[PDB]
Amino acid sequence: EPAMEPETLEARINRATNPLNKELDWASINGFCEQLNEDFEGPPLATRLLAHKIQSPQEWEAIQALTVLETCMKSCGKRFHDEVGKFRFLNELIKVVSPKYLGSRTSEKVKNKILELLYSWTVGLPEEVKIAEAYQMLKKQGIVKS
Amino acid sequence: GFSDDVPMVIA
């Protein structure tokens, strides 16, 4: 009586980023990355869902969401990489760290993790020209750790 | 032709 119809990306991400989680839910996290490739609508939906979660005022929700993003960048391939490397997504991270937007009430832990991940991708995936541009802009505008 | 993206938001 196990359900054949695929679990939704919404159901999956809500479990992977649930503020009640006592520790990282790796099964749900790995499951979400594994499933977002399953259709055309998948990877853009996944990035929209992640962007919302990352903007949470509840620190543990946002930190879990960033851990999903980190993990999916490792396990997933091109369609997901292409969605993350658009300003459609990158702008949502910018809004989290910028004082113009949400930055003044975002947790330092969340802001620092965003800067780490962006920096990591500049070195690990140098082809992604818009990730490089966004990161260069954040430095130019004086967005730094702590 | 046309971008499927949007302009970068400035921090």
Side-chain angles (χ1 to χ4, degrees):
Chain A
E1 39 142 328
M4 301 179 260
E5 190 187 53
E7 187 168 28
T8 62
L9 292 184
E10 286 88 10
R12 290 182 183 269
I13 201 166
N14 295 342
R15 195 173 54 252
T17 66
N18 199 317
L20 292 171
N21 289 343
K22 294 166 199 221
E23 304 263 26
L24 294 170
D25 185 355
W26 283 108
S28 292
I29 295 172
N30 294 329
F32 176 86
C33 298
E34 282 160 14
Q35 156 82 39
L36 60 85
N37 322 70
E38 285 314 287
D39 77 333
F40 191 63
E41 325 309 6
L45 179 56
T47 58
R48 298 189 265 106
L49 290 174
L50 285 163
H52 179 248
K53 295 298 192 186
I54 288 162
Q55 297 188 162
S56 181
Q58 297 185 56
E59 181 189 80
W60 178 223
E61 183 170 40
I63 289 293
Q64 288 178 99
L66 285 169
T67 301
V68 178
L69 178 59
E70 180 180 4
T71 299
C72 285
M73 286 290 279
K74 286 168 325 186
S75 67
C76 299
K78 185 166 173 306
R79 284 204 295 131
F80 186 76
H81 282 212
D82 282 340
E83 283 311 312
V84 168
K86 287 174 195 173
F87 293 125
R88 190 170 310 270
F89 182 69
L90 262 13
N91 285 350
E92 297 309 299
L93 297 183
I94 294 166
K95 285 162 186 183
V96 175
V97 303
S98 167
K100 292 170 87 175
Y101 292 101
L102 303 170
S104 85
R105 62 213 156 287
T106 299
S107 140
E108 290 79 10
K109 176 165 327 203
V110 167
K111 293 195 297 181
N112 290 177
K113 176 70 164 177
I114 286 164
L115 290 175
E116 265 302 282
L117 281 177
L118 290 172
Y119 180 72
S120 80
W121 302 324
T122 72
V123 180
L125 302 158
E127 342 68 94
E128 296 289 345
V129 307
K130 295 181 184 164
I131 295 175
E133 297 191 344
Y135 181 79
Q136 164 183 60
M137 177 278 291
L138 292 171
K139 300 335 232 165
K140 210 260 143 48
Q141 305 299 134
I143 318 291
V144 303
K145 288 216 199 145
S146 268
Chain B
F2 297 97
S3 198
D4 63 13
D5 203 2
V6 302
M8 180 175 70
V9 169
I10 312 306

